[PDB]
């Protein structure tokens, strides 16, 4: 019964998921002075023009915007990756206040939120098989700061009322995830894990340097979601982020100087 409260939050997760204290856990602090530029990293290739969104779901921990991943329609390639990784869903982590909410931090700076575009390695055939492999997933992480509105996020904001509580879903077709990207694709990369149980160590992380800006009103609407199901005492869906984990024997690489 893991979650983000005092009694079931990230300091507890190790009791059901011992990998929580593992060698390549996520998120991490990105120390920008110690990350090394790696001139051998290729530019990233984000091919989302044929992306087919289907549905949006409140899963009790976050909301997921789900995609049709039965063919190579929206893929991530290049960068640190070998092969082709298919988009399956995106979600966010965010805070109760603008001073916190992101999972990765940059020189200990916390952003208001963090977007995760989750992709799986097509060499493993499906998502469930991919998460059992050390190179099974590529997660594109994008920070959110509060400032100007993000026009391409507003369709997401406007559907959240219809999925307020755990287990609720809604049709969510024709959403274009290109409208969530910053201008630059400069990134940091490192090997890590899912940041929620089961905390599997199967992720190549690709964290963009450039945040996107969202409005105060936009993030206030994320904070009206609920962790509870319908007809349960209201617990607002806020601070659904895991804090930074020990880097251990890992090097964070930069794509840029």
CB of 149 to Zn ion, least distance (A): 23
The dihedral of CA 219, 68, 203, 169: what is its sign? positive
For the annotated catalytic residues, the residue numbers are: 61
The site string for Zn ion over 11-40 (x = CB under 5 A, - otherwise) reads ------------------------------
Both ends of the chain: CA-CA distance in Å?
43
b (16+ CB within 10 A) / e for 181-195: beeebebbbbbbbbb
Q: Tell whether residue 93 is among the known ligand binding residues.
A: yes
Nearer to Zn ion, 110 or 116 (CB): 116
75: which 2 tokens? 């893929």
d(CA 46, CA 129): 23
Is 119 a binder of Zn ion (CB under 5 A)? no
- Give how many residues touch Zn ion by CB under 5 A: 1
The site string for Zn ion over 160-179 (x = CB under 5 A, - otherwise) reads --------------------
Residue of the chain from 110, 116, 119, 166 that contacts Zn ion (CB under 5 A): 116
Nearer to Zn ion, 80 or 141 (CB): 141
Q: Tell whether residue 1 is among the known ligand binding residues.
A: no
The site string for Zn ion over 196-235 (x = CB under 5 A, - otherwise) reads ----------------------------------------
Distances (CA, A) of 220 to 120, 163, 238: 31, 15, 10
d(CA 253, CA 257): 11
Go through the chain and list every residue after which a break occurs, taking a C to next N gap over 2.5 angstroms, comma-separated.
none
**Which residues are near Zn ion by CB under 5 A?**
116
């Amino acid at each position: 019964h893991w979650g983000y409260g005092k009694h079931n939050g990230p300091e507890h997760w190790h009791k059901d998921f011992p990998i929580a204290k593992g060698e390549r856990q996520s998120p991490v602090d990105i120390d920008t002075h110690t990350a090394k530029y790696d001139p051998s990293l290729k530019p990233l290739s984000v091919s989302y023009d044929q992306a087919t969104s289907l549905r949006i779901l409140n899963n009790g921990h976050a909301f997921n915007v789900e995609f049709d991943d039965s063919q190579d329609k929206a893929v991530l390639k290049g960068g640190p990756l070998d092969g082709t990784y298919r988009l399956i869903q995106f979600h966010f982590h965010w805070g109760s206040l603008d001073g916190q909410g992101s999972e990765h931090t940059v020189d200990k700076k916390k952003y208001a939120a963090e977007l995760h575009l989750v992709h799986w390695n097509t060499k493993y055939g499906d998502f469930g098989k991919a998460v059992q492999q050390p190179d099974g997933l590529a997660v594109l992480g994008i920070f959110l700061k509060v400032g100007s509105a993000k026009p391409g996020l507003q369709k997401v904001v406007d559907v959240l009322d219809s999925i307020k509580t755990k287990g609720k879903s809604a049709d969510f077709t024709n959403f274009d995830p290109r409208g969530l990207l910053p201008e630059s694709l400069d990134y940091w990369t490192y090997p890590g894990s899912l940041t929620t149980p089961p905390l599997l160590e199967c992720v190549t992380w690709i964290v963009l340097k450039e945040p996107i800006s969202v409005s105060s009103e936009q993030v206030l609407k994320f904070r009206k979601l609920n962790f509870n199901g319908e007809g349960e005492p209201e617990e607002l869906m806020v601070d659904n982020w895991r804090p930074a984990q020990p880097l251990k024997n890992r090097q964070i690489k930069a794509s840029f100087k």
